[PDB]
Amino acid sequence: PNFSGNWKIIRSENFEELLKVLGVNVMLRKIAVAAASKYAVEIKQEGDTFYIKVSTTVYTTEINFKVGEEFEEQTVDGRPCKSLVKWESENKMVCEQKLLKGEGPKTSWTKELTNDGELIQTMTADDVVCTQVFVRE
Numbered sequence: 001p002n003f004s005g006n007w008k009i010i011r012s013e014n015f016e017e018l019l020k021v022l023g024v025n026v027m028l029r030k031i032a033v034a035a036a037s038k039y040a041v042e043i044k045q046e047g048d049t050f051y052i053k054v055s056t057t058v059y060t061t062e063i064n065f066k067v068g069e070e071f072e073e074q075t076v077d078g079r080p081c082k083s084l085v086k087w088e089s090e091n092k093m094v095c096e097q098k099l100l101k102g103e104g105p106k107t108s109w110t111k112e113l114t115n116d117g118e119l120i121q122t123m124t125a126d127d128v129v130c131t132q133v134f135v136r137e
Contacts, residue, residue, distance in 0.1 A: 001091060003050070003111070007041040007119045007134035018123060018130040021105055022077040041119065041134055067093065072100070075107045076123055
């Protein structure tokens, strides 16, 4: 019932298939699946404004946004995009993305707090949904 905290991953389903849809070649997909076993997420939320840092062993990115306000980030496979985040319920946000340049699959992500105390992130590329479960550090 509050997104802020330090989260560490405990499940990661369908990641490889998502990267396949995004054109990642086989060997890098496998290395990305290994690296995704160390996903850590740090969230600072205040009202409807968010700072979010997603890190692995060697790579870290920080996102900053307000619900309803377009902002710029990168897709899972690194292509820049304009993103817009909306609420779907008390503890779930959905983000639609659109590419700055070129084209490719429609991408989107979600974040959700379960009442069991988990953080659930999904990432979608066309018809493929990757699901990732996190618990408080």
